[PDB]
């Protein structure tokens, strides 16, 4: 339930994080502010962290 | 030929190690003391080094 | 158009490089001086950088 003023401000992002073991990966779900991510391609949900 | 006081004390562990070139890999095995490794998944052949 | 003095001095090498993202790879090619590379394959076109 998002106040109109906040629509588009937050995005729910799923990513592949590294783990303690070099050969394993884990799925992580976290909430980012729109100001910290950028789109990559347009008309797609591929987003990356702003400073990479 | 392992005496009773050595049971189990040593383990013969194999793993996939990195090498000089990023697209190459090698199979390595070595002998570890039991005190340096910790079982992963309770009773299983899978183990990780104690400090990883 | 290579003069006689330069035959075998330069090679056109293609490789897969890392990118800004952990999951994305790029094909890169460049011109190397022969003195900077060492063949790993006998008759193959496989070479590696001199200091790896």
């Amino acid at each position: 339930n998002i106040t109109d003023d906040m629509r588009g401000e937050l995005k729910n992002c799923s990513f592949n994080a590294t783990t303690e073991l070099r050969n394993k990966r884990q799925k992580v779900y976290s909430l980012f502010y729109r100001l910290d991510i950028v789109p990559m391609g347009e008309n797609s949900t591929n987003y990356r962290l702003i400073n990479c | 030929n392992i005496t009773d006081d050595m049971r189990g004390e040593l383990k013969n562990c194999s793993f996939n190690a990195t090498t000089e070139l990023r697209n190459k890999r090698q199979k390595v095995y070595s002998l570890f003391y039991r005190l340096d490794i910790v079982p992963m998944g309770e009773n299983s052949t899978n183990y990780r080094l104690i400090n990883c | 158009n290579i003069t006689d003095d330069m035959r075998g001095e330069l090679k056109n090498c293609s490789f897969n490089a890392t990118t800004e993202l952990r999951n994305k790879r790029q094909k890169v090619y460049s011109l190397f001086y022969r003195l900077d590379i060492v063949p790993m394959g006998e008759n193959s076109t496989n070479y590696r950088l001199i200091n790896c």
């Epitope: 070099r22 050969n23 990966r25 | - | 890392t18 952990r22």
Partner: antibody
């Protein structure tokens, strides 16, 4: 080695209820999507339904002819999958199986996800029944 | 739901022959969801191939398939005694329904 340890089969009539279930061994269900399929004697394979991992929402999908009377849930402690059936038809006689897809990606490095060993295992339970 | 049918209705091939089995979807389900399974009678079905391409781990390389729109297929390059089983295709066009099951016989 990965196994779905299936149990709960029994002798039932349409005028009753039955819960079938599978406990995992080796494989855990924290990231397991799972699905039930049934095969009536003399018939081919009919999908019953699917449950997504609770970490991805716990959403389920059911096949229209079996919807409502056949539902799917997950334990999340002892790795057990459940199929709860109630108020069944004479048409529901079948061997039911639990199935899952095991995806293993063993990476060659912790610095790039380019070179790795991908293994895909289709794991089935033994098959239990719903009788009439 | 998704309706899949098979052709030929039964296969009658000797071991060593190319036991090709095809199927058809009423729905134009993308090939990226195609799968085939081998069911030895009395056993749970075993996945051979998925994504109209990827082989399941442990499956012999005599098994390979392909497909596109409604036209999907499985090739056994050489039939072996281990293959005399019922084969099914599955098309996950938002539902994993299966075809009826086609027996490979001689």
């Amino acid at each position: 080695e990965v196994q779905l340890v299936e149990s709960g089969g029994d002798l039932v009539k349409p005028g009753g209820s039955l819960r079938l279930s599978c406990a995992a061994s080796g494989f855990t269900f924290s990231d397991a999507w799972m699905s039930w399929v049934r095969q009536a004697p003399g018939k081919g394979l009919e999908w019953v339904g699917r449950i997504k991992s609770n970490i991805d929402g716990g959403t389920t999908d059911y096949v229209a002819p079996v919807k409502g009377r056949f539902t799917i849930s997950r334990d999340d402690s002892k790795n057990t999958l459940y199929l709860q059936m109630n108020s069944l038809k004479t048409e529901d006689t079948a061997v039911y199986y639990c199935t899952t897809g095991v995806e293993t990606y063993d990476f060659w490095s912790g610095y790039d996800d380019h070179y790795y060993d991908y293994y895909f295992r289709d794991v089935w339970g033994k098959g239990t029944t719903v009788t009439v | 739901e998704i309706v899949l049918t098979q052709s030929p209705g039964t296969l009658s091939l000797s071991a060593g022959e190319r036991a090709t089995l095809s199927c058809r979807a009423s729905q134009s389900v993308s090939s990226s969801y195609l799968a085939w399974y081998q069911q030895k009678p009395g056993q749970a079905p075993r996945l051979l191939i998925y994504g109209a391409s990827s082989r399941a781990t442990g499956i012999p390389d005599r098994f390979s398939g392909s497909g596109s729109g409604t036209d999907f297929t499985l090739t056994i390059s050489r039939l072996e005694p281990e293959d005399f089983a019922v084969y099914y295709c599955q098309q996950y066009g938002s539902s994993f329904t299966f075809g009826p099951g086609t027996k490979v016989d001689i």
